[PDB]
Amino acid sequence: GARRAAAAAAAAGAFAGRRAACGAVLLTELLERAAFYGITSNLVLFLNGAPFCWEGAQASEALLLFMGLTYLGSPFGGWLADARLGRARAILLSLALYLLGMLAFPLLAAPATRAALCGSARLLNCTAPGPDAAARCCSPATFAGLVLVGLGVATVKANITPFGADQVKDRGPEATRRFFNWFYWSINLGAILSLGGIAYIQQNVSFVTGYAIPTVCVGLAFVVFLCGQSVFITKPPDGSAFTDMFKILTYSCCSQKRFDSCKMSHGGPFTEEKVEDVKALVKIVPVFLALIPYWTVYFQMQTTYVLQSLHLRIPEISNITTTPHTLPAAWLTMFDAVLILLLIPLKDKLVDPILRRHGLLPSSLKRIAVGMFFVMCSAFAAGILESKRLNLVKEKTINQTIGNVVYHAADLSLWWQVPQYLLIGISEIFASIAGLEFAYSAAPKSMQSAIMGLFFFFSGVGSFVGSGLLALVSIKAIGWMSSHTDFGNINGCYLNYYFFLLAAIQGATLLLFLIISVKYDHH
Amino acid sequence: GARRAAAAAAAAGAFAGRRAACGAVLLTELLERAAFYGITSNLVLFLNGAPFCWEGAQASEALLLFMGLTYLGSPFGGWLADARLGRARAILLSLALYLLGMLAFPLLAAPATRAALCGSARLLNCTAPGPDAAARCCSPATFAGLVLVGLGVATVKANITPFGADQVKDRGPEATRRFFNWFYWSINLGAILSLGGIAYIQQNVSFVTGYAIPTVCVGLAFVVFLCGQSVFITKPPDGSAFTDMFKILTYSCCSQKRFDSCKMSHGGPFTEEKVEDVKALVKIVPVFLALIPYWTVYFQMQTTYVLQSLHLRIPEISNITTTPHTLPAAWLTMFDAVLILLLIPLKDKLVDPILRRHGLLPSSLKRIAVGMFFVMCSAFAAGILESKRLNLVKEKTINQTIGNVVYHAADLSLWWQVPQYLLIGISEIFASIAGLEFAYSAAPKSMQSAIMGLFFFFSGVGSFVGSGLLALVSIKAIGWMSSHTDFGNINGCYLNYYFFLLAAIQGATLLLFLIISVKYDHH
Ligand SMILES: CCCCCCCCCCCCCCCCCC(=O)O[C@@H](COC(=O)CCCCCCCCCCCCCCC)COP(=O)(O)OC[C@H](O)CO
Ligand SMILES: CCCCCCCCCCCCCCCCCC(=O)O[C@@H](COC(=O)CCCCCCCCCCCCCCC)COP(=O)(O)OC[C@H](O)CO
Ligand SMILES: CC(C)CCC[C@@H](C)[C@H]1CC[C@H]2[C@@H]3CC=C4C[C@@H](OC(=O)CCC(=O)O)CC[C@]4(C)[C@H]3CC[C@]12C
Ligand SMILES: CC(C)CCC[C@@H](C)[C@H]1CC[C@H]2[C@@H]3CC=C4C[C@@H](OC(=O)CCC(=O)O)CC[C@]4(C)[C@H]3CC[C@]12C
Ligand SMILES: CC(C)CCC[C@@H](C)[C@H]1CC[C@H]2[C@@H]3CC=C4C[C@@H](OC(=O)CCC(=O)O)CC[C@]4(C)[C@H]3CC[C@]12C
Ligand SMILES: CC(C)CCC[C@@H](C)[C@H]1CC[C@H]2[C@@H]3CC=C4C[C@@H](OC(=O)CCC(=O)O)CC[C@]4(C)[C@H]3CC[C@]12C
Ligand SMILES: CC(C)CCC[C@@H](C)[C@H]1CC[C@H]2[C@@H]3CC=C4C[C@@H](OC(=O)CCC(=O)O)CC[C@]4(C)[C@H]3CC[C@]12C
Ligand SMILES: CC(C)CCC[C@@H](C)[C@H]1CC[C@H]2[C@@H]3CC=C4C[C@@H](OC(=O)CCC(=O)O)CC[C@]4(C)[C@H]3CC[C@]12C
Ligand SMILES: CC(C)CCC[C@@H](C)[C@H]1CC[C@H]2[C@@H]3CC=C4C[C@@H](OC(=O)CCC(=O)O)CC[C@]4(C)[C@H]3CC[C@]12C
Ligand SMILES: CC(C)CCC[C@@H](C)[C@H]1CC[C@H]2[C@@H]3CC=C4C[C@@H](OC(=O)CCC(=O)O)CC[C@]4(C)[C@H]3CC[C@]12C
Ligand SMILES: CC(C)CCC[C@@H](C)[C@H]1CC[C@H]2[C@@H]3CC=C4C[C@@H](OC(=O)CCC(=O)O)CC[C@]4(C)[C@H]3CC[C@]12C
Ligand SMILES: CC(C)CCC[C@@H](C)[C@H]1CC[C@H]2[C@@H]3CC=C4C[C@@H](OC(=O)CCC(=O)O)CC[C@]4(C)[C@H]3CC[C@]12C
Ligand SMILES: CC(C)CCC[C@@H](C)[C@H]1CC[C@H]2[C@@H]3CC=C4C[C@@H](OC(=O)CCC(=O)O)CC[C@]4(C)[C@H]3CC[C@]12C
Ligand SMILES: CC(C)CCC[C@@H](C)[C@H]1CC[C@H]2[C@@H]3CC=C4C[C@@H](OC(=O)CCC(=O)O)CC[C@]4(C)[C@H]3CC[C@]12C
Ligand SMILES: *[C@@H]1O[C@H](CO)[C@@H](O)[C@H](O)[C@H]1NC(C)=O
Ligand SMILES: *[C@@H]1O[C@H](CO)[C@@H](O)[C@H](O)[C@H]1NC(C)=O
């Protein structure tokens, strides 16, 4: 117990005379998240309403492919960072590409540059009379910008977090944990700023001035990272010999094609360090595989709660002061970010010291398990609430309005959703931070970026699997989501059952995760 | 991992050339449980319908006081067993009083002996015309039999289980665990036999022949235990010096009135053995305190599920073959016993070897936690089911009939309750057995009976607290249970919310229990 007090110095003393570097990293993360959320917030609406009037399916497919690219590039971004480059040079290059690609969107917004580009001058004005129509317009430039921005975001997301973490590695895992809590805090702050401001301006001032701001944010991110480069000196990996380790992994896998790995490696030219790293990689892959369902349910719940909310009473006299023409459809997502913003400081300053006081959770795996339990509880809460709403819709209905679509909602206040999102926030502040800490901590010192990329790739796989599941339950045979052929008319569909299904899926996952967690520590 | 295979001999080899003693103990346990459940199954109905027509409140109060006495006597029964007597002699004496007291009821059933006793000859026939009426009749004899039987059951329940466990103590905790699995199996088998057979005979043949059988069961229990006494020789504690240990606990508590206990004890005449036992007692008391809410929710769910079932469609063509005049109201309780009967063999023969194979749960506390999680899941399932039933009652209703009361039920098959009871059974086969194993294992070798009695007393405390809670939510101000002024009309009350409340109470308990469990192992 007394040794815990000895470690108390590291916790408070983590941010020793090096706070500037950590601040720079956090600021860069904030700016990049703000830009990313600004891009993804209303991309569908921008495409649909733009003079290049695509079909809703086309825009949805574009966004889905963009997100998939963001998930896919991450392991490759980590490979690039750890091989043939350093980490910092990788961040700089990725952010340069990020800015270059994202630049395109505001030009497309500006009518003069819009006409100058695409060599099409497509101004069919959607519903305006037109002699037939073409397919997705402005395809070359739009796709090019999308691929550039997606690759940039994937590479930065894979490379920055281990870069920041290894910054304070001089201290202990307690210091790393504190850094990670504040990292997630900054991420959420950027998400809030973007989703609130930029969405308000885009949906209520203009796209031309709306898409301009994210470009500025990414530019400032570039400048701040570049300036901090001089004072970082954060034990830069300078990965040039790291190139060798990546090729050796194949050589270890060559033995498979040619503790089985350990026995053959010792005799051959497989000096023990590489054997240990490959063994670690094998050990960790199962853990991400086991987290896949957690990502599935997480992303599915995140998507579903928004449609649930859209059909509850919108409060606050509909913002009587400064009447909200076209109330933006992003603050609904921002709710969870608000809750995490409130929670994280309390956690970091009170709970973690308390738990570390006596003997409590010293490992991240247990924290992920706790988060999963909280997710399950939240899913049940949401199911119950949606059940009551469904019984409450059979009576009269109120014609509310969000964006420019006349939703149908029940006479139930949106605040009733508070317990769900609260449990979600608790689950996130446990799980997400524990998972990032685990990914950084377990990976061999040579290829941390690669393992972080793999982590994010598996998260993307889970998101895609969840989307597939949502499509599956929509089949007529099941009939849970049959009238969901548009923005949404959940009133006619049984979403409550879906929440319970997620709870079951999450519940089973927790038990499965516990088994693997136990096995991992033993070995 | 290989040491697990070494322990495999104990698991299979637990029942070495000593199977006769364990068989005798299990048979005695089965007979005693059968008698106890036969007594408690329709005591209220027997009193209300007997020529000594009490009021429903009077009979309910009588049963409640009887159960409370059963819970209260347990620590005192353990004290008696461990001091001034041995365990076997305590069992014999307790069963003798058990039989003596229980004998009364069949005489009261027999009209000739009924008239001979009570010196009252109360034959007012309930609804038959009567010039006024008196209070609870046959009070002296009925109360005397009830107190005798309650004290007997408390003492046997406290004394037998550690007696059986220490029988196979030559082997390891794996052997003890196997014994406890089969102990619970026998308990459930006896419960099934009683609740089915004896309840059918009582409610469908006659009380005179119905209450005779439990007397026979307790008599055979006495005889089998007496006969096995010769071959038991199960390292009988022969507690005569154990008397000293109990008085010293006060002396350790005298230091409090005169590791604080350890420091003063070493210097004084408090040889370290007693210091260790008192320290252990202090450590364990918190654990029972922490389990109190688990007992609360367990007993509350057990009671509530029956009323839930009573309003679902009664299946099986109402037992078309041999039409069930006055379908008994005990098989509804017997459902859970059936499920545990099916589960326990599978657990014992498959799951426990599998878990012990690699590295999995080696401690009972974790098993109790798992059971609690399963209870929470079952509570949520029941809440959802009751919610759907409540929405399904608003339409037409069906007048079924159980006992002789015209219940109102919804057009929903009773089988829908299967998942609830399945999860309950899983939770029981984990928790209950783990808890018995813990109580026996942690207690100092001198006073195991006392700690088992304390365990059962805390279980009773939890049951009483749960009853108080159910009364509480019935208040008009809350209105969840307002029309429940009789056998039950939950159709007009919101039972579903109550199930969720238990889930929350259970959910919080699990987190609390985990903290204490962790602290216990550390110390
Ligand atoms: C290792 C990976 C395993 C798979 C993991 C993915 C998720 C598995 C769970 C998927 C659950 C599917 C839906 C629930 C299972 C029962 C089928 C069902 O939904 O029953 C409906 C009844 O539908 C049917 O009977 C149609 C059956 C279609 C066949 C496909 C579904 C069966 C399951 C297929 C997947 C396999 C799952 C195995 C169990 C894990 C009930 O809806 P309802 O009609 O009562 O709705 C209310 C109202 O009346 C509107 O209709
Ligand atoms: C360390 C020990 C702590 C205590 C542990 C015991 C259990 C604690 C939890 C007890 C829960 C009580 C009921 C739920 C709390 C909110 C009050 C409530 O039930 O609200 C009702 C509304 O009732 C009220 O507003 C009356 C309030 C009465 C005051 C007493 C209840 C408050 C809580 C008292 C106990 C303290 C609990 C603190 C929280 C843990 C809702 O029912 P309804 O009227 O909407 O029902 C449907 C239909 O409309 C029929 O009416
Ligand atoms: C939610 C739906 C869409 C399913 C999602 C995929 C699951 C079926 C995956 C997720 C986690 C996976 C498990 C993760 C880890 C392992 C350990 C693995 O065994 C090892 O230790 C690998 C090395 C060896 O072969 O010895 C065997 C497969 C298994 C149980 C996996 C089986 C398949 C699981 C359950
Ligand atoms: C760690 C502890 C808190 C246990 C873990 C589980 C709890 C967080 C769960 C158990 C029961 C759940 C509750 C069950 C039912 C409801 C009612 C539900 O509200 C409605 O459906 C209607 C509201 C109205 O209009 O009055 C909101 C969620 C809530 C509070 C749930 C919130 C989450 C709770 C407390
Ligand atoms: C903050 C956490 C820890 C407590 C649980 C969540 C709260 C945010 C809930 C609990 C009580 C709820 C309130 C209780 C009662 C109502 C009445 C409710 O009105 C109706 O049901 C009728 C609607 C109409 O006619 O306008 C509107 C929401 C409101 C204020 C609820 C808003 C959300 C509250 C504050
Ligand atoms: C390669 C093997 C080992 C399988 C694992 C690869 C995954 C990346 C696959 C498996 C299932 C796939 C999903 C199956 C079904 C769909 C539904 C599909 O949705 C639609 O196009 C219909 C609805 C709409 O139009 O929006 C979108 C792709 C998605 C999520 C797929 C994305 C890619 C997934 C997750
Ligand atoms: C552990 C995981 C992988 C499997 C368990 C997932 C459950 C949450 C699913 C599986 C089957 C589902 C049930 C299948 C059928 C129905 C009937 C459905 O409609 C009715 O009530 C009428 C049905 C009829 O008319 O027969 C209501 C939901 C319910 C109970 C579903 C609720 C959600 C359940 C329990
Ligand atoms: C270890 C795994 C299985 C996760 C732990 C939790 C599960 C056991 C829970 C999650 C969701 C629950 C289900 C949610 C909803 C339902 C529907 C419910 O039935 C109804 O509401 C109506 C049934 C009908 O008439 O169709 C019966 C319980 C059940 C299957 C529940 C059973 C228990 C489940 C599977
Ligand atoms: C009774 C039958 C029908 C259930 C079939 C499924 C079982 C095989 C599952 C249900 C719950 C599972 C358990 C859920 C959680 C855990 C916790 C985990 O225990 C730990 O080691 C926790 C950490 C520690 O002990 O320090 C090991 C796996 C285990 C026991 C699981 C083992 C497999 C179990 C028993
Ligand atoms: C469900 C409702 C009716 C409440 C039921 C009673 C609870 C309030 C009890 C059950 C478990 C109890 C806890 C069990 C054990 C302890 C440890 C105890 O601290 C010790 O270790 C005692 C020795 C010391 O004083 O140092 C302090 C009280 C506490 C937290 C208890 C506080 C009160 C609790 C939560
Ligand atoms: C065994 C476990 C692992 C699976 C889940 C629990 C089962 C016991 C459930 C699942 C499907 C259920 C059946 C699905 C559909 C129905 C129709 C249902 O009929 C109605 O809802 C209408 C009633 C009428 O009109 O008579 C009667 C119950 C029954 C047979 C259910 C009985 C209970 C079943 C077998
Ligand atoms: C002594 C101090 C430390 C409190 C702990 C002692 C417990 C044994 C007490 C606390 C609350 C009591 C309960 C509070 C309220 C009631 C309701 C009461 O029910 C009625 O008489 C009304 C309903 C009916 O007539 O059936 C029965 C006793 C009971 C369960 C009590 C039984 C004894 C309890 C559990
Ligand atoms: C962790 C433990 C100790 C506390 C949490 C227990 C919950 C399961 C309780 C506390 C408050 C309860 C809620 C209080 C009020 C209501 C309103 C009640 O009635 C209505 O739907 C109308 C209410 C209105 O008109 O305002 C429905 C159940 C609900 C949500 C209750 C469901 C069960 C809740 C969430
Ligand atoms: C974020 C705020 C608003 C939540 C306030 C309540 C917390 C203080 C609770 C919520 C969940 C609780 C946890 C639930 C379960 C556990 C498991 C337990 O961990 C173990 O030691 C498990 C066994 C092992 O590690 O081997 C220690 C207590 C802990 C972390 C609890 C500590 C207290 C926590 C964090
Ligand atoms: C629709 O036509 C108007 C008037 O000609 C023009 O100003 C506007 O840009 C067109 N809209 C789009 C989306 O191209
Ligand atoms: C009611 O009266 C009948 C006929 O006199 C008698 O046989 C019966 O025992 C009485 N019932 C009771 C419960 O005493």
Domains with residue ranges and CATH for chain B: 19-125+138-240 (1.20.1250.20), 283-523 (1.20.1250.20)
Amino acid identity, position B97: L
User: How many of the other CB atoms lie within 10 Å of CB of A482?
Assistant: 14
Q: Which residue has the tokens 């059933």?
A: B109
SS percent in chain A: helix, strand, coil, step 5:
75, 0, 25
- Answer yes or no: do B360 and A391 touch at CB < 8 A: no
Amino acid identity, position B285: V
- Which residues lie closer than 8 Å to A129 by C-beta, 6 or more apart? none
CA B443 to chain centre: 21
Q: Which residue has the tokens 């007979």?
A: B31
Closest CA–CA distance from residue A507 to any residue of chain B (Å): 9
What is d(CA B45, CA B42) in angstroms, rounded to the nearest whole number? 5
Residues in chain B within 8 Å Cβ distance of A522: 359
Q: Which of A351, A366, A384 to mutate to test the interface with B (most CBs of B within 10 A)?
A: A384
Integer CA distances (angstroms), B4 to A281, B14, B350, B473, in order: 28, 15, 15, 50
Q: Locate A3 and state its tokens.
A: 């040794």
Closest CA–CA distance from residue A386 to any residue of chain B (Å): 12
**Torsional sign, CA B52, B55, B60, B66:** negative
Among the partner-chain residues A383, A507, A522, the one whose CB lies closest to the CB of B359 is A522
What is d(CA B300, CA B313) in angstroms, rounded to the nearest whole number? 23
User: How many of the other CB atoms lie within 10 Å of CB of A395?
Assistant: 8
Residue ranges in B347-400 assigned as alpha helix (H): 352-357, 364-393
Give me the DSSP letters along A427-467. HHHHHHHHHHHHHHHHS-TT-HHHHHHHHHHHHHHHHHHHH
Contact B491, B393 (CB under 8 A): yes
Q: How many A from CA of B422 to the centre of ligand 14?
A: 28
- Which residues lie closer than 8 Å to A282 by C-beta, 6 or more apart? A261
A267 part of contact set with chain B, CB < 8 Å: no
Among the partner-chain residues B358, B500, B522, the one whose CB lies closest to the CB of A359 is B522
Contact B32, B223 (CB under 8 A): no
Nearest residue of A to residue B517, measured between CA atoms: A360
User: How many of the other CB atoms lie within 10 Å of CB of A204?
Assistant: 13
Burial A1-20 (b: 16+ CB within 10 A, else e): eeeeeeeeebbeebbeebee
Q: Locate B29 and state its tokens.
A: 């346990």
Q: Locate B418 and state its tokens.
A: 């299967």
Q: Locate A513 and state its tokens.
A: 């995760």
B514 in ligand 14 pocket by Cβ < 6 Å? Answer: yes
Integer CA distances (angstroms), B484 to B154, B481, B488, in order: 31, 6, 5
What is d(CA B264, CA B270) in angstroms, rounded to the nearest whole number? 9
Could you say which DSSP state residue B409 is in? E
Looking at ligand 4, which residue's alpha carbon is closest to its atom 18? A385
B504 in ligand 2 pocket by Cβ < 6 Å? Answer: no
What is d(CA A18, CA A62) in angstroms, rounded to the nearest whole number? 42
Q: How many A from CA of B407 to the centre of ligand 11?
A: 21
- Which residues lie closer than 8 Å to A28 by C-beta, 6 or more apart? A91, A95, A160, A221, A224, A225, A228
B522 part of contact set with chain A, CB < 8 Å: yes
Ligand that comes closest to the CA of residue A514 = 9
What is d(CA B280, CA B295) in angstroms, rounded to the nearest whole number? 22
Nearest residue of A to residue B388, measured between CA atoms: A387
Q: Which residue has the tokens 């043939």?
A: A84
CA B235 to chain centre: 28
- Answer yes or no: do A359 and B383 touch at CB < 8 A: no
Integer CA distances (angstroms), B483 to A52, A210, A337, B407, B488, in order: 64, 60, 44, 14, 8
Residues 368-397 on B with a CB inside 8 Å of A are 377, 380, 383-384, 387, 391
Number of residues written out for chain B: 523
Q: How many CB pairs (< 8 A) connect A and B?
A: 26
Tally of CA atoms within 13 A in the half-sphere of A245 that contains its CB = 22
- Answer yes or no: do B515 and A360 touch at CB < 8 A: yes
Nearest residue of B to residue A370, measured between CA atoms: B511
User: How many of the other CB atoms lie within 10 Å of CB of B464?
Assistant: 17
- Answer yes or no: do A360 and B518 touch at CB < 8 A: yes
Give me the DSSP letters along A33-63. HHHHHHHHHSHHHHHHHSSS---HHHHHHHH
User: How many of the other CB atoms lie within 10 Å of CB of A382?
Assistant: 27
Beta bridge partners of A405: A402
Integer CA distances (angstroms), B450 to B160, B274, B453, in order: 12, 15, 5
**For residue B474, which of B482, B486, B485, B463 has the smallest C-alpha distance?**
B482
* Rg over CA atoms, chain B: 24
Q: Which atom of ligand 4 is nearest to the CA of A388?
A: 21
Residue B479 zone, left/alpha/beta (φ > 0; ψ -120 to 50; rest)? left
Contact A257, A423 (CB under 8 A): no
Nearest residue of B to residue A379, measured between CA atoms: B380
Contact B232, B21 (CB under 8 A): yes
Burial of B71 (0-12, 13-18, 19+ CB in 10 A): buried
Ligand that comes closest to the CA of residue B416 = 11
**For residue B330, which of B103, B34, B31 has the smallest C-alpha distance?**
B34
Residue A403 zone, left/alpha/beta (φ > 0; ψ -120 to 50; rest)? left
Burial A208-224 (b: 16+ CB within 10 A, else e): bebbbbbbebbbbbbeb
Q: How many A from CA of B327 to the centre of ligand 8?
A: 29
Q: Which of B356, B357, B363, B380 to mutate to test the interface with A (most CBs of A within 10 A)?
A: B380
- Answer yes or no: do A518 and B360 touch at CB < 8 A: yes
Among the partner-chain residues B360, B500, B522, the one whose CB lies closest to the CB of A384 is B500
Give me the DSSP letters along B238-267. --STHHHHHHHHHHHHHHHH--HHHHHHHH
Residues in chain B within 8 Å Cβ distance of A387: 384, 387
Among B478, B484, B497, B511, name the best residue to mutate to test ligand 2's pocket (greatest count of ligand atoms within 8 A of Cβ). B478
* Pairing status of strand A408-409 against strand A398-399: antiparallel
Among B185, B339, B356, B370, name the best residue to mutate to test ligand 9's pocket (greatest count of ligand atoms within 8 A of Cβ). B370
Angle (CA) B238-B243-B246 rounded to 5° is 130
Q: How many A from CA of B69 to the centre of ligand 6?
A: 63
- Which residues lie closer than 8 Å to B149 by C-beta, 6 or more apart? B39, B66, B98, B101, B102
Looking at ligand 15, which residue's alpha carbon is closest to its atom 10? A125
Using a 6 Å CB cutoff, which residues line ligand 15? A 51, 123, 125
Amino acid identity, position A303: T
Nearest residue of A to residue B523, measured between CA atoms: A359
**Torsional sign, CA A444, A447, A452, A456:** negative
B498 part of contact set with chain A, CB < 8 Å: no
Beta bridge partners of A391: none
**For residue A455, which of A222, A159, A109, A137 has the smallest C-alpha distance?**
A159
Could you say which DSSP state residue A138 is in? T
A508 in ligand 9 pocket by Cβ < 6 Å? Answer: no
User: How many of the other CB atoms lie within 10 Å of CB of B331?
Assistant: 17
Instruction: Give the H or E element holding residue B412.
Output: strand B408-413
Q: Locate B40 and state its tokens.
A: 């408690």
Q: Locate B429 and state its tokens.
A: 């086969």
Last residue before each gap in chain A (C to N over 2.5 A):
258
Ligand that comes closest to the CA of residue A423 = 4
Residue ranges in A258-324 assigned as alpha helix (H): 260-267, 272-309
Give me the DSSP letters along B163-214. HHHHHTTTS-HHHHHHHHHHHHHHHHHHHHHIIIIIHHHHHHT-HHHHTHHH
What is d(CA B479, CA B483) in angstroms, rounded to the nearest whole number? 9
What is d(CA B152, CA B73) in angstroms, rounded to the nearest whole number? 9
Among B260, B262, B288, B289, name the best residue to mutate to test ligand 10's pocket (greatest count of ligand atoms within 8 A of Cβ). B289
Ligand that comes closest to the CA of residue B316 = 11
Q: How many A from CA of B47 to the centre of ligand 16?
A: 15
User: How many of the other CB atoms lie within 10 Å of CB of B264?
Assistant: 15
What is d(CA B84, CA B241) in angstroms, rounded to the nearest whole number? 9
What is d(CA A335, CA A341) in angstroms, rounded to the nearest whole number? 10
Last residue before each gap in chain B (C to N over 2.5 A):
258
Q: Nominal resolution in Å?
A: 2.8
Contact B203, B49 (CB under 8 A): no
- Answer yes or no: do B359 and A507 touch at CB < 8 A: no
Could you say which DSSP state residue A488 is in? -
List the beta strands (DSSP E) in B49-183: none
Burial A160-173 (b: 16+ CB within 10 A, else e): bbbbbbbbbbebeb
Q: Locate A200 and state its tokens.
A: 């308000």
Burial of B387 (0-12, 13-18, 19+ CB in 10 A): buried
Contact B43, B194 (CB under 8 A): no
User: How many of the other CB atoms lie within 10 Å of CB of A503?
Assistant: 23
Give me the DSSP letters along B134-148. -SSTTHHHHHHHHHH
Residue A316 zone, left/alpha/beta (φ > 0; ψ -120 to 50; rest)? left
Q: Locate A298 and state its tokens.
A: 């997480």
Q: Locate A157 and state its tokens.
A: 């997301």
Q: Which of B3, B357, B363, B384 to mutate to test the interface with A (most CBs of A within 10 A)?
A: B384
Contact A521, A363 (CB under 8 A): yes
CA A400 to chain centre: 30
Q: Which residue has the tokens 């005397």?
A: B144
What is d(CA B392, CA B464) in angstroms, rounded to the nearest whole number? 33
Contact A189, A51 (CB under 8 A): no
Q: How many A from CA of A99 to the centre of ligand 8?
A: 49
Amino acid identity, position B218: V
What is d(CA B158, CA B426) in angstroms, rounded to the nearest whole number? 25
Looking at ligand 6, which residue's alpha carbon is closest to its atom 25? A57
What is d(CA A389, CA A410) in angstroms, rounded to the nearest whole number? 7
